[model samples]
Target chain A: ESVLTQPPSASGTPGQRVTISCTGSATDIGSNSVIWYQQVPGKAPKLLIYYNDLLPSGVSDRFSASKSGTSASLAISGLESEDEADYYCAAWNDSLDEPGFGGGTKLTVLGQPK
Target chain B: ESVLTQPPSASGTPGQRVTISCTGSATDIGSNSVIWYQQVPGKAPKLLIYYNDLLPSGVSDRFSASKSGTSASLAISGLESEDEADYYCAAWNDSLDEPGFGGGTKLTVLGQPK
Candidate 1:
C-alpha cells in the first residue's frame, strides 16, 4: 500500500473542475509539507504544487492545492484536454525520514463541454 | 552527470549487479540528502532509498545506493526479473529551494542466471 492514498481515477469535461484527494498520517502531511506532481504518459513527472499550495515557475494558476491536518487536496479548475494525465501527491514522512507518494489519480478529460 | 542527469537505459543479467547513476549540482546533492524511487509500468513510483543510502521498510537488501559529492548511484545486486523498472533520483535544490527529479533510468533484466 502507498503511504499516501489517492483515488485511482477521476474524470471531467472541458471547463469543469475536479479535485483529487491525498490522505496521509501525522508523520507526513501533518508536518504541513506536501508536493504534487503531474505525469503525462511516457514522460517524467513534473512538479505541480510544492510546499502544499505553491505553484512552480510555469504551472497554470488553475492548478491549486491545500492541506489540512493529515489530508491534502489538489484542485484543477478550467480543465482541458491537455489536463488528461496522472496526478500524484507526495509528502515527507517524518517517521521514516523518507518521501512517500500517493497511488496516483488518472484524470481523463471526457470530451468537450456540452 | 549534471542537473539530475541519468542515462535513459540500463541492463543486467540475473545474478549480476547493475548501477544507475544520477548527477546533480552542489546546490542539490552536495547540500542535501538524495532519494531514490522505483517505478513499475502503469503504477505509482515507490520510495526505494532515502537519505542517500537507507532503505525504507520492505525494500530488499539487494538494493543499495551511495552518494559522493554531487553525484549518486543506485546499485542492484543479484538482479532479478522483478527488478526491471524505471529508477529515479531526487533531491532538494538549495539554489531553487525546491525538489528535483532525474529523467529516470529504465532497467531491463536480460535473462535467467547462468
Candidate 2:
C-alpha cells in the first residue's frame, strides 16, 4: 500500500502561486525529510527540492517546499506555462525500511488572459 | 545526461531471464545502497528493491538485485508479459546529500522469434 498521497490535479495562471500537498503518516514524513521532484511528460523526474526546503543546483528559487507533522507541500511562485508538469514527493520510511512516493500532482499553468 | 546511466530498453522472452544495469559514480552507488522502482504507464512508481537488494513485502522472488562498487543490477527471472514496465535505479549521493535516479529502462516481455 502507498504511504503517501497527493491530489491528482491543480491549476494556476501566470504570476499566480499554486501549491500541491503530499500527506503521509508519522512513521514516514513526520520523521524524515521530504524530497520533491518535477517531471515533464515523457521525461524522468528531476529533483527540484531536497530535505524539505533546499533546492538542488539549476533549480529555480521560484520553487519552495515545506513539511509539517505528517504532511508536506510544494509551492510555485511566478508560475509560468513552462512550469506545467507533474510534481511528486518522496520520503524514507523506517517502518517499511524503504522509500515511499506520493501519487503525483499534475500542475496546469493556464495561459494568461489577453 | 543523468547522474546515473541505464540502457534505454531491454527485452526478454516469456519465462526468460533479463538483467538491467545501472551505473553510477563513487558519490552515489559506490557509497550508498541502491534502490529500484517499477512504474507502469500511468500509475505511480512502486519500490521493487531497497538497501541494494532487499525486496519489500508483496514483491515476488522472481525479482532480484545486486550492487558492486559503482554499479548495480536488477535481474528478473520467469519474465511475464505483465512485467513490462519502466525500471529506475536510485541512490543517495553523499556529495550532494540528495537522491538521484537513472534515466529508466523500459522492459519488454516478448515471444521467441519463429
Candidate 3:
C-alpha cells in the first residue's frame, strides 16, 4: 500500500466544485509540504499545487489546496470539461529522504446533458 | 515543453542493459540531485533513484543512477519483461521553486524467441 491514501475516483458537474483528499502519516504529510499534479490520459503530469497550497505560475485560479494535520486536499472550483483528468498527491518523505506518490484520483466532470 | 527532456522511447532484449537519460538545467539537475521513477501500466509510480544516484530501499541493485553536469541517467541491467514500463525523471527547480518531470520514456523489453 502507498504511504499516502486517496480515493480511486471523484465526479462533479461542470462549473461546480470538487475536492480530492490525500491522507498520510506524520512523517510524510504532517511534517512535510504536499504537492499535487494533474495528468490526462496518454499525457505527462503537470504540477498544480506545490508546497502544500502555493499554486504554480500560470495555474488556473480555480485550483486550490488546503492542509490540515495529516491530510491535504485539492479543490477544483468552476470545474470545466478540460478538467477531467487524474489527480495525484506527492510529498517528500524527510524521514527516508524519498518522494511519495498517491495512487491518483480520476476526476470526471459531468457536463450538462445536451 | 518540459523543463527536463528525455527521449520518447527505448528498447532492449532480455539480459541486455539500457540507460535512460534525463537532461535538466543548471538550476535543477545541475545543482540538485535528480530523481527517477518507474510506472507500470495502471499503477502508481515507484521511486527508483533518489539523491542523484542512491537507490531506494527494496529497489534492486540492477538499477543505478548517476549525474554529471546538467544531465543524469538511470541504468537498468539484466533487462527483463517486467522492466518494460514508462520511466520518468524529476528534479527540484530552484528557479520555479517546484519539482519538474520529464515527459516520460517508454521502455520496451523484447522477450526471448521460442
Candidate 4:
C-alpha cells in the first residue's frame, strides 16, 4: 500500500549526472502510475514527472525519467546551473489512503567533476 | 495556459460551513482531472481530491468535494477547527514537463459564526 520509497540522498559533482529512484510496490509503481515533484528552496513544489515517463512539454530534455520493476528514476544529465534542488517522488498511496511523497533527495550540484 | 484558479481567501466560524473553489480551463479543469491539496503550516500538503472528485479514504466526509464545468470545488460541511489551512488546486500543465500548483487560499477559522 505504500506508494513509493526512496533513498534519503544522492550527491554528485556539478557537470555529472545523478539519478534519484522512487520505487512503488506492485499496487502503484508497477502499475505505471507515479508523479515526481521538485521543491527547490522556498518555492512550492513543481511537478517534475507525471503519468509514468512522459515529460511535460516545455521541460528540457536534460531532465529525463524512466521506470523499471516498480521503480522509477528522475535523471538529470549534464547537470546545470539550476539543478540544485530538493527532488520528491509521489504517487497515490493506497495505504494511508492519500497521495504520498518520498522523503526527498537533495541534489547538491558541486563544482565541476574532478 | 493556467492550470487552476482559486479565491484568495475564505472565512468561517469553527462550527459553520464553507467552501473553496478551484476553477480550471476548458483544456484542464474542464476535463475533470483537477486535484486539490490542503497544507496546514509546517506539515506537508495533503491530497483532498484526485482525478477530479475522488476523496482519499480516512478523509472526513465533512470534507466533501465536487466539480462543475471548468471549476472544481472542495466543500467542508459542518466545518471544524482543523479546517484552517491553505488550500491549492493543481493539475498537469501539459505545456511543461510537470504539473502546476495554484498560489494558495488561506482559510481563517473564527471561534464561532453568529
Candidate 5:
C-alpha cells in the first residue's frame, strides 16, 4: 500500500467540477508541503500543483489544491475531457525522511454536456 | 517544464544488470539530490531511491543509484520479472523553485535466463 491514500477513481462531465482527496499522516502531509502530478495515458507525469496550492507556470487556474492537517485535495473546475487522467499527490515524510506518494486517482471526464 | 530527461524505454534479461540514466542541468540535479520512483502498470508510483542513492527501507539492495554532476543513474541488479516497470527521476529545480521530473523510462525484463 502507498504511504498516502487516495480514491481509485473519480468522474465528472464537461463544465463540472471534480475533487480528489489524498490522505496522509502527521509525518508527511502534516509536516511538509504537498505536490501533485497529472499523468495521461502513455505519457510521463507532469507537475500540477506544488507547495500545497501553488500552480506551476502554464498550469491552468482551473486546477487548484489545498491541504488541511494531514489531508489534501485537488480540485479541477470546469472540467474538460482533456482533464481526464491520473492524479497523484506526494509529500515529504519526516518520519521516513523520504518522499511518499498517494495511491493515485484516475479521473474520467464523461461525455460533453448536452 | 521537465528539466530531467530519460530514455523512453530499456530492457534486460533476468540475472542481468540494467541501468537507466537521467540527464539534467546545473539548476536541478547539479545542485540538489535526485529521487527515483517505480510504477507498475496499474498501481501508484513508489519511492525507490532518494537523496541520490539512499534506498528506503524494504527496498532491495539489488536496487542502487548514483549521481554525478548533472546526471544520475539507477541500476537494477539481478533483474527480476517484478522489476519491470516505469522509472522516473526527479529533483528540485533551483531555477524554478519547484520539483521537476524526468520523462521516465519503461523497463522490460525480457525473459528468464536460459
Candidate 6:
C-alpha cells in the first residue's frame, strides 16, 4: 500500500463542487509535492493536477488543487460528465524518500439517485 | 506531461517474456528514480517497481525492472494470462519540474498460435 490515504467515495451533483483529499506523511505529502489524477471508467488516468497548482496545458481551471500542511486536495468545480471518475494522489514517501502512490478515491457524479 | 514515454502495446506468446520501455531525459530518468505500476481490468493500479528494482511486498519476482541511459524498462518473465493488462511507468518530470505519468503500454498475453 502507498503511504498516502484517501477516502473511498465522495459524491456531488452535476455543476456542484466536490473535494477529494489525499494525506501523507512528512516524507511524502508533507515534505514533498503531490500530483493528482482522474481516471474515468474504461480509460487511462489523466493528469488533472500537478505540482502545487501547475496543471498541464489544456486542463481547465475548474479542476483545481491546493495543499496545506501534510494534506493535498483536488477540488472539482463546475463538474461535467467527464469529471466523474476515480481520483488519486501520489508523492515521494518521506520515510524512504522514494516515490509512492495512493489508494484512489471514487467520485460519483450523480444526476439523480432516483 | 510526464517525462517518460512508453509503447502503445506489446504482445508475447504464453510462457514467453516481454519488456516495456519508458524513455526520459538526462535530468529525469538519468538522474532521478523510476517507478512502475500494473493496472488490471477494473481494479486500481498496483506497485510493481520502485527505486528502479525494489518490488513491493508480495509482488511477483517474474516482474523485473531496470533503468538504462534515459530509459527505464519493465520486463515480465514467464508471462501468464493474469499479466494481460496496462502497465504505466512514471517519474518526476524534469522539464515541467513536477511529477507525471506515462501514457501506459497495454501488454497482451497470447496463447500458442494454433
lDDT of each: 0.82, 0.82, 0.82, 0.70, 0.83, 0.76
At residue B36, give the lDDT of candidate 2.
85
lDDT of 6 by residue, A1-114 (tens): 367889989888788888888887778877776767665444435555656566654467787899998889888888777676777887767677566777888887888546
Best by DockQ: 6
Name the regions of candidate 4 deviating beyond 4 angstroms: A2-32, A35-66, A73-114, B1-3, B40-43, B112-114
lDDT of 6 at A105: 89
lDDT of 2 by residue, B11-91 (tens): 988998899999999999999878787765444456577679987545778999999999999999999987888889988
Q: Model 1, range A1-114, lDDT digits (tens) per residue?
A: 299999999999899989999999999999847878776544445667767887644477888899999999999999999898888887779887677878889999987566
Instruction: Report model 3's TM-score to 2 decimal places.
Output: 0.53
Q: Can you write out model 1's per-residue Cα lDDT over B1-114, one digit (the tens) per residue?
A: 245999999998889989999999899999888878776544445667767898655577888999999899999999999888888898888877777878889888997566
List TM-scores for all candidates, in order: 0.54, 0.53, 0.53, 0.54, 0.53, 0.60
Fraction of true inter-chain Cα contacts (below 8 Å) kept per model? Answer: 0.00, 0.00, 0.00, 0.00, 0.00, 0.00
Interface RMSD, candidates in the order listed: 11.0, 11.5, 11.7, 11.5, 11.5, 10.8
Report the poorest 10 consecutive residues by lDDT, candidate 6 chain A.
Answer: A39-48
Q: How well is each residue in A1-114 modelled by candidate 3, as lDDT tens digits? A: 287999999998878889999999888899887878776544445667766897654577888999999999999999898888888997777776777878889988886565
DockQ, per model, reads 0.05, 0.06, 0.05, 0.07, 0.05, 0.07
| Candidate 1 A-chain TM-score | 0.92
Question: CA shift at B44, candidate 5, in angstroms?
Answer: 20
**If you superpose only chain B onto the true chain B, what TM-score does each candidate give?**
0.91, 0.92, 0.92, 0.83, 0.92, 0.88
Task: Judging by lDDT, tell me the better candidate of 4 and 6.
Answer: 6
Worst 10 residues of 6 chain B by lDDT: B38-47
- Model 2: residues with Cα > 4 Å off, grouped in runs: A40-42, A112-114, B1-114
- Model 5: per-residue Cα lDDT over A26-97, one tens digit each: 999998888788755444456677668987545778989999999999999999988878888888888777
Q: CAPRI band of model 3?
A: incorrect
RMSD of 5: 7.3
